[PDB]
Design an enzyme around this catalytic site. Structure first.
Site, PDB file in Angstrom:
ATOM      1  N   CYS B  14     -11.014  -1.053   0.979  1.00 29.17           N
ATOM      2  CA  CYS B  14     -10.868   0.381   1.266  1.00 29.17           C
ATOM      3  C   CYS B  14      -9.866   1.046   0.322  1.00 29.17           C
ATOM      4  O   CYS B  14      -9.605   2.242   0.452  1.00 29.17           O
ATOM      5  CB  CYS B  14     -10.448   0.594   2.731  1.00 29.17           C
ATOM      6  N   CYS B  17      -4.956  -1.534   0.254  1.00 22.55           N
ATOM      7  CA  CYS B  17      -3.982  -2.492  -0.256  1.00 22.55           C
ATOM      8  C   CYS B  17      -3.351  -1.937  -1.538  1.00 22.55           C
ATOM      9  O   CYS B  17      -2.134  -2.028  -1.732  1.00 22.55           O
ATOM     10  CB  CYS B  17      -4.664  -3.849  -0.496  1.00 22.55           C
ATOM     11  N   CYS B 122      -8.736  -8.426   4.475  1.00 18.65           N
ATOM     12  CA  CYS B 122     -10.145  -8.542   4.049  1.00 18.65           C
ATOM     13  C   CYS B 122     -10.357  -9.727   3.101  1.00 18.65           C
ATOM     14  O   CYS B 122     -11.194 -10.622   3.356  1.00 18.65           O
ATOM     15  CB  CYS B 122     -10.641  -7.283   3.323  1.00 18.65           C
ATOM     16  N   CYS B 160      -3.206  -5.294   6.966  1.00 18.80           N
ATOM     17  CA  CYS B 160      -4.245  -4.281   6.791  1.00 18.80           C
ATOM     18  C   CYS B 160      -3.638  -2.878   6.896  1.00 18.80           C
ATOM     19  O   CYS B 160      -3.759  -2.219   7.921  1.00 18.80           O
ATOM     20  CB  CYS B 160      -5.382  -4.533   7.801  1.00 18.80           C
ATOM     21  N   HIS B 204       6.994 -10.610  18.245  1.00 21.67           N
ATOM     22  CA  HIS B 204       7.538 -10.509  19.608  1.00 21.67           C
ATOM     23  C   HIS B 204       8.941 -11.151  19.734  1.00 21.67           C
ATOM     24  O   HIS B 204       9.872 -10.507  20.240  1.00 21.67           O
ATOM     25  CB  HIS B 204       6.502 -11.100  20.560  1.00 21.67           C
ATOM     26  N   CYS B 207      11.401  -8.828  18.281  1.00 23.91           N
ATOM     27  CA  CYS B 207      11.194  -7.420  18.606  1.00 23.91           C
ATOM     28  C   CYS B 207      12.400  -6.809  19.309  1.00 23.91           C
ATOM     29  O   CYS B 207      12.970  -7.418  20.219  1.00 23.91           O
ATOM     30  CB  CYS B 207       9.992  -7.277  19.518  1.00 23.91           C
ATOM     31  N   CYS B 227       8.847  -1.793  26.868  1.00 23.70           N
ATOM     32  CA  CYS B 227       8.033  -2.670  26.038  1.00 23.70           C
ATOM     33  C   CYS B 227       6.579  -2.164  26.024  1.00 23.70           C
ATOM     34  O   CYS B 227       6.087  -1.590  27.012  1.00 23.70           O
ATOM     35  CB  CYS B 227       8.145  -4.106  26.587  1.00 23.70           C
ATOM     36  N   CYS B 233      -0.002  -4.203  22.996  1.00 22.93           N
ATOM     37  CA  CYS B 233       0.756  -4.806  21.887  1.00 22.93           C
ATOM     38  C   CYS B 233       0.381  -6.273  21.606  1.00 22.93           C
ATOM     39  O   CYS B 233       0.407  -7.121  22.528  1.00 22.93           O
ATOM     40  CB  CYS B 233       2.264  -4.672  22.118  1.00 22.93           C
ATOM     41  N   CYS B 242       7.639  -7.500  10.159  1.00 22.60           N
ATOM     42  CA  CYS B 242       7.681  -6.044  10.368  1.00 22.60           C
ATOM     43  C   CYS B 242       8.848  -5.577  11.219  1.00 22.60           C
ATOM     44  O   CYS B 242       9.380  -4.500  10.983  1.00 22.60           O
ATOM     45  CB  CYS B 242       6.385  -5.565  11.016  1.00 22.60           C
ATOM     46  N   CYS B 254       4.865  -0.067  13.546  1.00 16.49           N
ATOM     47  CA  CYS B 254       3.792   0.061  14.525  1.00 16.49           C
ATOM     48  C   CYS B 254       4.278  -0.018  15.963  1.00 16.49           C
ATOM     49  O   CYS B 254       3.819   0.738  16.814  1.00 16.49           O
ATOM     50  CB  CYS B 254       2.696  -0.972  14.267  1.00 16.49           C
ATOM     51  N   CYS B 260       1.596  -3.056  18.026  1.00 18.06           N
ATOM     52  CA  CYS B 260       1.119  -3.962  16.982  1.00 18.06           C
ATOM     53  C   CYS B 260      -0.351  -4.283  17.276  1.00 18.06           C
ATOM     54  O   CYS B 260      -0.720  -4.579  18.429  1.00 18.06           O
ATOM     55  CB  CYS B 260       1.955  -5.261  16.987  1.00 18.06           C
ATOM     56  N   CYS B 263      -2.483  -7.092  12.573  1.00 19.73           N
ATOM     57  CA  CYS B 263      -3.286  -6.844  11.379  1.00 19.73           C
ATOM     58  C   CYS B 263      -3.197  -7.936  10.309  1.00 19.73           C
ATOM     59  O   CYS B 263      -4.076  -8.015   9.475  1.00 19.73           O
ATOM     60  CB  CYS B 263      -2.979  -5.450  10.793  1.00 19.73           C
TER      61      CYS B 263
HETATM   62  S1  SF4 Z   1       6.754  -4.242  22.295  1.00 19.55           S
HETATM   63 FE1  SF4 Z   1       5.195  -5.853  21.718  1.00 19.55          FE
HETATM   64  S2  SF4 Z   1       6.299  -7.312  20.326  1.00 19.55           S
HETATM   65 FE2  SF4 Z   1       7.898  -5.987  21.358  1.00 19.55          FE
HETATM   66  S3  SF4 Z   1       8.639  -7.114  23.180  1.00 19.55           S
HETATM   67 FE3  SF4 Z   1       6.916  -5.819  23.888  1.00 19.55          FE
HETATM   68  S4  SF4 Z   1       4.959  -7.030  23.624  1.00 19.55           S
HETATM   69 FE4  SF4 Z   1       6.666  -8.032  22.465  1.00 19.55          FE
HETATM   70  S1  SF4 Z   2      -7.003  -5.402   4.067  1.00 22.84           S
HETATM   71 FE1  SF4 Z   2      -7.204  -3.420   5.230  1.00 22.84          FE
HETATM   72  S2  SF4 Z   2      -6.098  -1.992   3.857  1.00 22.84           S
HETATM   73 FE2  SF4 Z   2      -6.644  -3.814   2.516  1.00 22.84          FE
HETATM   74  S3  SF4 Z   2      -8.768  -3.442   1.644  1.00 22.84           S
HETATM   75 FE3  SF4 Z   2      -9.072  -4.477   3.673  1.00 22.84          FE
HETATM   76  S4  SF4 Z   2      -9.411  -2.734   5.140  1.00 22.84           S
HETATM   77 FE4  SF4 Z   2      -8.363  -1.895   3.351  1.00 22.84          FE
HETATM   78  S1  SF4 Z   3      -0.086  -4.070  13.140  1.00 26.10           S
HETATM   79 FE1  SF4 Z   3       1.605  -5.596  13.641  1.00 26.10          FE
HETATM   80  S2  SF4 Z   3       1.496  -7.056  11.914  1.00 26.10           S
HETATM   81 FE2  SF4 Z   3       0.348  -5.233  11.216  1.00 26.10          FE
HETATM   82  S3  SF4 Z   3       1.929  -4.007  10.140  1.00 26.10           S
HETATM   83 FE3  SF4 Z   3       1.905  -3.253  12.265  1.00 26.10          FE
HETATM   84  S4  SF4 Z   3       3.576  -4.440  13.313  1.00 26.10           S
HETATM   85 FE4  SF4 Z   3       3.119  -5.500  11.344  1.00 26.10          FE
END
Ligand code: SF4
Ligand code: SF4
Ligand code: SF4
Ligand code: FCO
Ligand SMILES: [Ca+2]
Ligand SMILES: [Ca+2]
Ligand SMILES: [Ca+2]
Ligand SMILES: [Cl-]
Ligand code: NI
Ligand SMILES: [S]
Lengths: 489, 279
Positions: B14, B17, B122, B160, B204, B207, B227, B233, B242, B254, B260, B263
């Site tokens: 897409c 990246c 991907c 992603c 987690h 977090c 949470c 999540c 992250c 995220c 989250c 991804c």
């Molecule tokens: S927000 Fe998501 S990663 Fe953070 S403590 Fe809660 S479930 Fe875990």
């Molecule tokens: S990994 Fe996600 S951001 Fe990267 S080319 Fe694939 S769909 Fe697009």
């Molecule tokens: S979806 Fe989860 S793993 Fe992906 S960038 Fe956001 S916090 Fe990080």
């Protein structure tokens, strides 16, 4: 005396594009546009929790994911029967508006400008066409050529940082970018705080300064050197717009209004009159005559005789119509930026107050760039206003439940043009999902009646005085800012 | 002194990246392009097009044989003899045209590379194009290499999109290893070929909402405190840094913003769906 030129990959667009032209007597006399990559999001989406669609559809394109997210959450809002709050609407506009700025800047500089500006002598700026008709070639006064080229190249380099700052702005209430987390059915997931509104505003003022002081002046200067490029890349001169950035809670008024302009006449946009043909596309339809998106079908067939593209062919009242900043700016006909009014007079001897005052010049290679720059300024004016309207602490999210059976459509304008997502739900799952995207309207192949798509048609008449350096072919194509990920999905 | 040669190819991607890479800081993209890598081929940003672009790509792959990084963005579709992704056309010495599929391109370039780096979920794992419902036979780089019996050093940088720090960090670590392998060993990879440097931490466990999770304080909706577990999540099942690094130059991430969605994981999206239903 015909010569065929085939360009695959046509680079400095998003995604996989092939352009074929026939040249005779120094001009393009025929053209074919082909999208060569397919993923099938409409198939992948089937059977899922409908809420997942606003994450999945963003992966159609990492340049414009906020447009797809916006269309998807609006389709979901419609299907789920939930009304977004004032602050939710504004927050969604701030997330998306920040990427409009990013996308137009990315396009002009990092996709389009290397057809005009000579970069340094290292990859990826070289190799390049030997006779590329650049600023350094066109401007006969060498000191002026050097100074203007350096001026453009320094803006290209500075724009790398400006577009990155636009993504800080998107992430402010969007979570991250590419691929936001902050827009969902029912509104937005994070209520703006006074501190974060101020942090968005501080970044925005830097972007806005670049737009007004650097980008707009470069575009008008560029056009004053390439006056011939306001006189070619014309096409159908039919445009359509769906409305973008709703300015009130009932979605009756927009920053840029919906409308159609066909064969010299304005009309209202009626979504019932959109249909897709597949006669020259790698798809099977269960019935002839083209299909409205609400009964759209995605049955890929790369073996279909006579087909040449994975892009379908959308038509409005059986007419090809183009989309994008030119379309929106033509339909709305807003007042030009103060920079544009001034430079059109100073550099061209043109008196112009409103976009349509450009007349024929709007429908050209340079007209498309001008429209995009002007729209960047117009969007910045709007973001500046939205930053005053947004209310720290005011609820941005309203709860909803997945319906058993429903339909919804989200309409918006992606930076590249008109966008809708159609969603049908059955047994609380996605039964059908149909995407009619921006570049789909521009970079489509011939329909069943042989009518060329807008880019194909706009290529007709483009000068190619040097077949080994056919620079105007790419200049035309890139003026449309094509995204083939979006076009095909 | 010398920059890392890179040939960056796109399959069923897409461009996200690439766009995420453009968001790099410390170094920023200008310094990356002028000082760190030689980006020899990249369809989104390079000056040349068509025949000239492809000829340059193949010239670099020959001149820098065994000495360039093949960067792959997007999945590799194998159905219909590869015809769901045509990456270019090559004009032989007689005037005839031949389309090049993503399968053909990767089969050609991977053995010429010093290493292949699959950036994004991907290319690394199949991701969205390879998800349930697809009909393109969409495949990851690792699976295509296995099917093709291609033995070439492969490092996966998923996400992603991936964070630019993960892509830049991995490429710089790889290049440093090539320049001095005993001073700079290759980053240790997990069982899914991704560097523990970036993908060793569980979201987690790291977090900032973990105290709330432990006290059963769960956000009732996105805009309530607590949470995010009940909102869907996937942090508990996701390994990336992250929570420490955040996104877009530390602006947000995220989990603070929403949830989250896992991804970076090899089972994204299907194993992480529905996104708004708890794990
Ligand atoms: S927000 Fe998501 S990663 Fe953070 S403590 Fe809660 S479930 Fe875990
Ligand atoms: S990994 Fe996600 S951001 Fe990267 S080319 Fe694939 S769909 Fe697009
Ligand atoms: S979806 Fe989860 S793993 Fe992906 S960038 Fe956001 S916090 Fe990080
Ligand atoms: N802008 C944008 Fe992408 C395209 N074309 C979408 O929708
Ligand atoms: Ca074919
Ligand atoms: Ca579609
Ligand atoms: Ca083999
Ligand atoms: Cl960052
Ligand atoms: Ni796009
Ligand atoms: S967007």
């Amino acid at each position: 005396g015909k010569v065929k030129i085939s360009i695959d990959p046509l680079t400095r667009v998003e995604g996989h594009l092939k352009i074929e032209v026939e040249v005779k007597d120094g001009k393009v006399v025929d053209a074919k546009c082909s999208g060569g990559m397919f993923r099938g999001f409409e198939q992948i989406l089937r059977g899922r929790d409908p809420r997942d669609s606003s994450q999945i559809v963003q992966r159609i394109c990492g340049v414009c994911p906020t447009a797809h997210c916006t269309a998807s959450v609006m389709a979901q809002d419609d299907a789920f029967g939930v009304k977004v709050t004032t602050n939710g609407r504004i927050t969604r506009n701030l997330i998306f508006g920040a990427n409009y700025l990013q996308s137009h800047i990315l396009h002009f500089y990092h996709l389009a400008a290397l057809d005009y500006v000579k970069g340094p002598d290292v990859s990826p700026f070289v190799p390049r066409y030997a006779n590329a008709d650049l600023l350094t070639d066109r401007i006969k006064d060498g000191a002026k050529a050097d100074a203007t080229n350096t001026y453009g190249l320094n803006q290209y380099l500075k724009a790398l940082e400006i577009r990155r700052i636009c993504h800080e702005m998107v992430a402010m209430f969007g979570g991250r970018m590419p691929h936001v987390q902050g827009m969902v059915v029912g509104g937005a997931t994070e209520i703006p705080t006074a501190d974060k509104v101020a942090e968005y505003a501080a970044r925005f003022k830097e972007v806005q300064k670049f737009v007004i002081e650097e980008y707009l002046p470069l575009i008008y200067t560029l056009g004053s050197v390439y006056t011939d490029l306001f006189e070619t890349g014309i096409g159908w001169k039919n445009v359509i717009a769906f409305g973008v950035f709703p300015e009130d809670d009932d979605y009756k008024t927009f920053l840029l209004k919906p409308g159609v302009y066909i064969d010299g006449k304005d009309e209202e946009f009626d979504s019932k009159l959109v249909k897709e043909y597949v006669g020259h596309s790698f798809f099977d339809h269960s019935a002839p005559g083209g299909l409205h998106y609400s009964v759209g079908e995605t049955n890929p067939n790369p073996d279909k005789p006579g087909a040449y593209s994975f892009v379908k062919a959308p038509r409005y009242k059986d007419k090809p119509c183009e989309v994008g900043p030119l379309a929106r700016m033509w339909v709305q006909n807003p007042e030009l930026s103060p920079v544009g009014q001034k430079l059109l007079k100073e550099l061209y001897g043109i008196e112009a107050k409103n976009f349509r005052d450009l007349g024929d010049k709007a429908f050209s290679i340079m007209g498309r760039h001008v429209a995009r720059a002007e729209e960047t300024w117009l969007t910045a004016v709007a973001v500046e206003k939205w930053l005053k309207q947004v209310q720290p602490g005011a609820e941005t999210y309203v709860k909803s439940e997945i319906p058993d059976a429903a339909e919804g459509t989200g309409f918006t304008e992606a930076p590249r043009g008109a966008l809708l997502h159609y969603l049908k739900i059955k047994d609380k799952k996605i039964e059908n999902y149909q995407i009619v995207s921006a570049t789909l309207w521009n970079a489509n192949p011939r329909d069943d009646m042989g009518q060329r798509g807008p880019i194909e048609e706009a290529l007709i008449g483009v000068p190619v005085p040097d077949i080994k350096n056919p620079v105007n072919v790419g200049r035309l194509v890139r003026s449309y800012d094509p995204x083939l990920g979006c076009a095909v999905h | 002194a010398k920059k890392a040669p890179v040939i960056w190819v796109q399959g069923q991607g897409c461009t996200g990246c690439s766009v995420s890479l453009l968001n790099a800081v410390h170094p920023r993209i200008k310094e990356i392009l002028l000082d760190v890598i030689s980006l020899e081929f990249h369809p989104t940003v390079m000056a040349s097009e068509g025949e000239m672009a492809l000829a340059h790509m193949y010239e670099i792959a020959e001149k820098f044989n065994g000495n360039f990084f093949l960067l792959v963005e997007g999945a590799i579709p194998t159905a219909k003899e590869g015809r769901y992704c045509i990456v270019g056309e090559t004009l032989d010495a007689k005037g005839h045209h031949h389309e090049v599929t993503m399968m053909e391109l990767i089969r050609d370039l991977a053995p010429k590379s010093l290493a292949t780096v699959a950036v994004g979920t991907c290319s690394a794992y199949g991701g969205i194009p390879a998800a349930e419902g697809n009909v393109t036979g969409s495949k990851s780089v690792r699976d295509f290499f296995a099917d093709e019996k291609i033995e070439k050093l492969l490092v996966n940088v998923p996400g992603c999109p991936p964070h630019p720090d993960w892509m830049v960090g991995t490429l710089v670590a790889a290049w440093s290893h090539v320049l001095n392998p005993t001073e700079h060993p290759l980053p240790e990879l997990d069982d899914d070929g991704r560097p523990l440097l970036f993908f060793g931490d569980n979201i987690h466990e790291n977090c900032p909402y973990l105290d709330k999770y432990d006290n059963s304080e769960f956000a009732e909706t996105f805009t309530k405190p607590g949470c995010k577990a009940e909102l869907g999540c996937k942090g508990p099942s996701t390994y990336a840094d992250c929570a420490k690094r955040r996104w877009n130059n530390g602006i947000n991430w995220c989990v603070e913003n929403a949830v989250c969605i896992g991804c970076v994981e090899p089972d994204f999206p299907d194993g992480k769906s529905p996104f708004y239903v708890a794990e």
